[PDB]
Design an enzyme around this catalytic site. Sequence first.
Site, mmCIF file in Angstrom:
data_model
loop_
_atom_site.group_PDB
_atom_site.id
_atom_site.type_symbol
_atom_site.label_atom_id
_atom_site.label_comp_id
_atom_site.label_asym_id
_atom_site.label_seq_id
_atom_site.Cartn_x
_atom_site.Cartn_y
_atom_site.Cartn_z
ATOM 1 N N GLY A 22 -43.906 -11.467 29.786
ATOM 2 C CA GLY A 22 -44.773 -12.655 29.802
ATOM 3 C C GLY A 22 -44.146 -13.818 30.530
ATOM 4 O O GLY A 22 -42.934 -13.851 30.742
ATOM 5 N N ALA A 23 -44.976 -14.798 30.891
ATOM 6 C CA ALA A 23 -44.474 -15.984 31.574
ATOM 7 C C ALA A 23 -45.440 -17.120 31.323
ATOM 8 O O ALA A 23 -46.666 -16.940 31.262
ATOM 9 C CB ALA A 23 -44.293 -15.733 33.048
ATOM 10 N N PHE A 26 -43.128 -22.733 29.674
ATOM 11 C CA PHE A 26 -41.792 -23.021 29.123
ATOM 12 C C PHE A 26 -40.748 -21.924 29.365
ATOM 13 O O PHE A 26 -39.588 -22.053 28.962
ATOM 14 C CB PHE A 26 -41.902 -23.334 27.628
ATOM 15 N N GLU A 28 -40.034 -17.425 30.356
ATOM 16 C CA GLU A 28 -40.440 -16.037 30.486
ATOM 17 C C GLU A 28 -39.880 -15.185 29.334
ATOM 18 O O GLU A 28 -38.916 -15.570 28.659
ATOM 19 C CB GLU A 28 -39.942 -15.468 31.819
ATOM 20 N N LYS A 43 -35.871 -14.048 25.815
ATOM 21 C CA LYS A 43 -36.686 -15.215 26.160
ATOM 22 C C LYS A 43 -35.844 -16.259 26.906
ATOM 23 O O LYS A 43 -34.777 -16.651 26.424
ATOM 24 C CB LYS A 43 -37.295 -15.843 24.923
ATOM 25 N N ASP A 134 -47.693 -20.723 12.126
ATOM 26 C CA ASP A 134 -48.371 -20.095 13.287
ATOM 27 C C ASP A 134 -48.634 -18.595 12.951
ATOM 28 O O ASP A 134 -48.441 -17.698 13.794
ATOM 29 C CB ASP A 134 -47.496 -20.274 14.545
HETATM 30 C C1 LIG Z 1 -46.717 -7.204 27.186
HETATM 31 O O1 LIG Z 1 -46.260 -7.700 25.923
HETATM 32 C C2 LIG Z 1 -45.321 -7.005 25.179
HETATM 33 C C3 LIG Z 1 -44.350 -7.703 24.431
HETATM 34 C C4 LIG Z 1 -43.393 -7.019 23.669
HETATM 35 N N1 LIG Z 1 -42.435 -7.640 22.922
HETATM 36 C C5 LIG Z 1 -42.301 -8.965 22.694
HETATM 37 N N2 LIG Z 1 -43.123 -9.870 23.272
HETATM 38 C C6 LIG Z 1 -42.971 -11.182 23.016
HETATM 39 N N3 LIG Z 1 -43.799 -12.092 23.579
HETATM 40 C C7 LIG Z 1 -44.829 -11.751 24.559
HETATM 41 C C8 LIG Z 1 -45.078 -13.007 25.404
HETATM 42 C C9 LIG Z 1 -46.400 -13.015 26.169
HETATM 43 C C10 LIG Z 1 -47.571 -12.527 25.313
HETATM 44 C C11 LIG Z 1 -47.284 -11.127 24.776
HETATM 45 C C12 LIG Z 1 -46.081 -11.214 23.847
HETATM 46 N N4 LIG Z 1 -46.413 -12.059 22.712
HETATM 47 C C13 LIG Z 1 -41.949 -11.636 22.182
HETATM 48 N N5 LIG Z 1 -41.110 -10.790 21.594
HETATM 49 C C14 LIG Z 1 -41.223 -9.473 21.805
HETATM 50 C C15 LIG Z 1 -40.265 -8.554 21.111
HETATM 51 N N6 LIG Z 1 -39.357 -9.047 20.245
HETATM 52 O O2 LIG Z 1 -40.361 -7.385 21.388
HETATM 53 C C16 LIG Z 1 -43.412 -5.630 23.661
HETATM 54 C C17 LIG Z 1 -44.362 -4.928 24.401
HETATM 55 O O3 LIG Z 1 -44.376 -3.556 24.359
HETATM 56 C C18 LIG Z 1 -45.662 -2.901 24.380
HETATM 57 C C19 LIG Z 1 -45.335 -5.600 25.161
#
Ligand SMILES: COc1cc(Nc2nc(N[C@@H]3CCCC[C@@H]3N)cnc2C(N)=O)cc(OC)c1
Length: 271
Positions: A22-23, A26, A28, A43, A134
């Site tokens: 994600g991006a 604030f 990525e 992050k 949240d």
């Molecule tokens: C494609 O989105 C995936 C995200 C994750 N994992 C995570 N995404 C985190 N934020 C993202 C930001 C942008 C919005 C999506 C999420 N919230 C935060 N933390 C973790 C984590 N601790 O794994 C795993 C994945 O595998 C399938 C797909």
Amino acid sequence: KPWWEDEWEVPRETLKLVERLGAGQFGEVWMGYYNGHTKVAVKSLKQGSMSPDAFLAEANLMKQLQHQRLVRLYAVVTQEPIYIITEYMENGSLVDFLKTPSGIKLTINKLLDMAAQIAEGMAFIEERNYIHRDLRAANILVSDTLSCKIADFGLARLIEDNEYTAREGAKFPIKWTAPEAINYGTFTIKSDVWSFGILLTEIVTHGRIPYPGMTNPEVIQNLERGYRMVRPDNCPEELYQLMRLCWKERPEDRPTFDYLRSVLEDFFTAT
Ligand SMILES: COc1cc(Nc2nc(N[C@@H]3CCCC[C@@H]3N)cnc2C(N)=O)cc(OC)c1
């Protein structure tokens, strides 16, 4: 502890960022590896976008909130670009997972199982005198074994005196947030309970937006009349009545998360 004594600090060289997940404004979020072999979420803070002290506050809180049911802080890199490194959750956010072919196939039994896991993590937060603020399916993450963990602690706060009062220009998602928090900026663990009732609608509708076909003003209007969200399609009536307990008018009349966990485990084992 300063960075040279902090058990959480790691050299940036220990990390390899592989896939951007994600991006945003604030920074990525990446999937990466620590020391070659261990998959992690990284992050990164976009310099200038927000204070580095503000960014790292999230990591400091996670240091106090360690439990199997909460996404675990892995490490920090406190030189720019600052990283917060966490437990990787292989099936991503619950809101996204429930829309995939795997998520679509889940029975109500399993959805009730996952709701109880979430209540279990929230019961730990409650016991530690924290609030999350949240709580929503976008902020629950799912593991490769289909277990759920609470994530995104940026708004999370230690309660000194039962309640936290936000800034009066502070703004929150109307559909998920308790009336007393929207109205007065006042948050307690009972505000998270309200949010949990809304989260239960997202679980049962495989991630649909709450209050179908309503704008925010319409949601506020109906709630003040004493209406609550209409019964979602294919929602067990027992589960709907549990949601209604979370949406009691007086915060103090809403149940504890420990109660919610207990009931949902009973719903699960009976299904
Ligand atoms: C494609 O989105 C995936 C995200 C994750 N994992 C995570 N995404 C985190 N934020 C993202 C930001 C942008 C919005 C999506 C999420 N919230 C935060 N933390 C973790 C984590 N601790 O794994 C795993 C994945 O595998 C399938 C797909």
